[PDB]
C-alpha cells in the first residue's frame, strides 16, 4: 500500500525536514495526518488530482505540502521545533471507494540539540540455572541501556531468522535519570525458549537494535563517534551444562 | 469533529470493551474503525454505512444510532492482543474524515497457573539482570527507589502455540551493593527468590 519515507527523522531546532508520500494509483490522496499523544489523529491538508482542497488543519507558518506529481506527496516543515515532533500519517482513497488506506508514517523528533543524541548499548544475559531447573524453560533477556532519543526497534534473530512468538518487548523505554526531562534511555525484551531448546550449543541467539539518530549529512565536533542511525546487536550461543 | 471515549481502556481478558464515538454532522454516511498496532499503520478492521444500524464481522460489532449522532464499536471476550490503538472516524460524501482521538486499549491477561520467581541472568562480561516472572496478573512492579538501580514494567507475553501467558519485569544494577534477594520491593506475590 502506501509508501512514506523516511519511517524515522530526527533534526535539531531550526533544520528543514521534508517528508515523502507515495499514495496508491487514486486520486483522494494527500490526508495527511498529525498523530501525537495529546491530540490524537488530527487532519493536515487533502488533495484530489494534485490539487489542494482543505489545508484546514495546517500549521498557519512554516509547514507546506505539495503534490510534484500524481503518485508522490510531500510535506516540508521549514525551522522545526521540538513542537513538531509527533507521528506524520499519509493516506489516500479511491474514486467510488469509502476506503482509507493510510501509510506507517514518519516519526519526527525535533530536539534542542543534537550533542545529546547517543547509540544504545546492547548486551543479551543468559537464562538462569534456577529457572531452567524449576520451569524447564529459558528465558533470554536484552537490555538497550543509553541511547536518545527513543526511535529505537529491537528484534530477536534465531539462527538468523527473526523470530515473534515467545517474544515480550517493553512497550515503552524508561528513563535512566526520570528527573530530567532530556534523559538517556533503556529499553528491555525478553526471549523465552523450551530448556531443551536453549541447551542445544549449535542455537544461536542474536537481539538486535535498530537506532536512529544522525544523517552522515549533519556535523559532528564532539570527539566521541558520531551517533549515526546505525544496528546495534548483542548474542548468545546455547549450553549444554 | 468527533468525540471518542474512552482515551485508554483497561479490560480484563475474556471480558467484553465498547468504544464509544459521536459526531457534529447530520451528513455522515461513513463510519470506519481502524486498528493501529505500535509501530504499524492504521488499518481498516470494521465499518458501517448510514444504510445499516448494527453490523457482525470478523469478531467485531458495530453500532450506528443517526438520530443520536453517536456510533460505537464492541469486542466481546477479549484476549491480549486485542491490545492495540483504535480510532473511529465520521465521513461525508468523497471528501472529509473526520477522527476520534483514539482507545488506546489494553487486556489484562488471566495468568492461570502463577509461578513467582525471582532469578538471577548473566553473560559477556554492570553483568548481572534479575528477572521476575510468572507472577500473577494482580502484582505491581513498582520503580526503583533506588538510584542507579533500575526496574522495568511488567510485560505480558501470550503464545499463539499454547494456552499459557506470563508476566515478567527486568531489573538492574552496577552498584556492588545491589542482588536479586532485596532488589523487587514492591508488593510481591508471596514466592520464591531461590538461589
Known amino acids: 500500500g502506501v509508501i512514506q519515507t523516511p519511517r524515522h527523522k530526527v533534526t535539531g531546532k531550526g533544520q528543514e525536514a521534508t517528508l515523502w508520500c507515495e499514495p496508491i494509483?487514486?486520486?483522494?490522496?494527500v490526508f495527511w495526518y498529525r498523530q501525537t499523544i495529546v491530540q490524537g489523529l488530527e487532519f493536515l491538508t487533502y488533495f484530489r488530482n494534485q490539487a489542494p482542497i482543505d489545508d484546514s488543519g495546517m500549521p498557519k507558518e512554516r509547514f507546506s505540502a505539495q503534490m510534484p506529481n500524481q503518485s508522490h506527496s510531500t510535506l516540508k516543515i521549514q525551522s522545526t521545533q521540538p513542537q513538531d515532533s509527533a507521528v506524520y500519517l499519509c493516506?489516500?482513497?479511491?474514486?467510488?471507494?469509502?476506503?482509507?488506506?493510510f501509510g506507517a508514517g514518519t516519526r519526527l523528533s525535533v530536539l534542542e540539540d543534537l550533542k545529546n543524541v547517543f547509540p544504545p548499548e546492547v548486551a543479551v544475559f543468559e537464562p538462569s540455572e534456577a529457572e531452567i531447573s524449576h520451569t524447564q524453560k529459558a528465558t533470554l533477556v536484552c537490555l538497550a541501556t543509553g541511547f536518545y532519543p527513543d526511535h529505537v526497534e529491537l528484534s530477536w534473530w534465531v539462527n538468523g531468522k527473526e523470530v515473534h512468538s515467545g517474544v515480550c518487548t517493553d512497550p515503552q523505554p524508561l528513563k535512566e535519570q526520570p528527573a530530567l526531562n532530556d534523559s538517556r534511555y533503556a529499553l528491555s525484551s525478553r526471549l523465552r525458549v523450551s530448556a531443551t531448546f536453549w541447551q542445544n550449543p549449535r542455537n544461536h541467539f542474536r537481539c538486535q537494535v535498530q537506532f536512529y539518530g544522525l544523517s552522515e549529512n549533519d556535523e559532528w565536533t564532539q570527539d566521541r563517534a558520531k551517533p549515526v542511525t546505525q544496528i546495534v546487536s548483542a548474542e548468545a550461543w546455547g549450553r549444554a551444562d | 469533529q468527533v468525540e471518542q471515549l474512552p482515551s485508554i481502556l483497561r479490560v480484563q481478558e475474556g471480558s467484553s470493551a465498547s468504544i464509544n464515538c459521536s459526531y457534529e454532522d447530520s451528513a455522515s454516511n461513513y463510519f470506519p474503525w481502524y486498528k493501529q498496532e505500535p509501530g504499524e499503520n492504521p488499518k481498516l478492521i470494521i465499518d458501517?454505512?448510514?444504510?445499516?444500524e448494527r453490523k457482525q464481522t470478523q469478531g467485531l460489532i458495530v453500532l450506528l444510532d443517526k438520530k443520536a449522532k453517536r456510533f460505537s464499536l464492541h469486542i466481546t471476550d477479549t484476549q491480549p492482543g486485542d491490545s492495540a490503538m483504535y480510532f473511529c472516524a465520521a465521513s461525508v460524501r468523497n471528501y472529509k474524515y473526520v477522527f476520534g482521538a483514539g482507545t488506546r486499549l489494553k487486556v489484562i491477561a488471566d495468568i492461570q497457573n502463577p509461578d513467582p520467581a525471582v532469578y538471577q541472568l548473566r553473560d559477556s562480561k554492570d553483568k548481572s539482570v534479575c528477572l521476575f516472572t510468572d507472577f500473577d496478573s494482580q502484582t505491581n512492579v513498582s520503580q526503583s527507589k533506588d538510584s542507579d538501580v533500575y526496574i522495568t514494567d511488567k510485560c505480558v507475553l501470550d503464545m499463539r502455540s499454547m494456552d499459557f501467558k506470563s508476566n515478567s519485569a527486568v531489573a538492574w544494577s552496577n552498584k556492588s551493593d545491589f542482588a536479586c534477594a532485596n532488589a523487587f520491593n514492591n508488593s510481591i506475590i508471596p514466592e520464591d527468590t531461590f538461589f
Open positions: 458501517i454505512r448510514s444504510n445499516m
Open positions: 494509483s487514486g486520486h483522494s490522496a
Open positions: 493516506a489516500s482513497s479511491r474514486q467510488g471507494q469509502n476506503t482509507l488506506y
